Structure 1
Amino acid sequence: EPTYCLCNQVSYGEMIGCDNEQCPIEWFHFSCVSLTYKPKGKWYCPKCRGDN
């Protein structure tokens, strides 16, 4: 029932959480943020890291 990411779809596969505690979305699907492997260190979603 709950949806996440920029696509606003349910949880599926591997998801990564934005390290900004105040991120409005928080969880994103790896594919939606062009990731294949768990990043090392802090990770911020496109919105929080300043992308358009």
Structure 2
Amino acid sequence: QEEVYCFCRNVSYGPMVACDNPACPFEWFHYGCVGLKQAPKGKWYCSKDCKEIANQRSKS
């Protein structure tokens, strides 16, 4: 695909992942955008926040 996902103003070059979090302002982020490889544990949180934001919600 050729668009623009992560807040890095770019799109899916190859290794990608969606904000596997209920909140997460978006559902598509690049590894160059964030920080990881092959999306650790299979599921990765769109951003260091996309993870924390999920912790702030759902069961406290």
- TM-score, structure 2 as length reference: 0.57
Instruction: Give the superposition deviation at 1:22.
Output: 4.0
Render the CA deviation track for 1:18-50: whole Å, top value 9, x for unaligned: 112442221111122221233115422222223
**Hey, what does 1:49 align to over in structure 2?**
51
What runs of 5+ residues in structure 1 fail to find an aligned partner?
none
Give the number of aligned pairs.
51
**Whose strand proportion is higher, 1 or 2?**
1
Mapped pair 1:25 → 2:8? no
SS in structure 1 opposite 2:29? Answer: strand
Mapped pair 1:4 → 2:32? no
In structure 2, what residue type is equivalent to 1:15?
A: M
Q: Identity percentage over the alignment?
A: 55
- TM-score, structure 1 as length reference: 0.61
SS in structure 2 opposite 1:10? Answer: coil
Which is higher, the Rg of structure 1 or of structure 2?
Answer: 2
* Structure 1: distance between partners of 2:49 and 2:18: 13
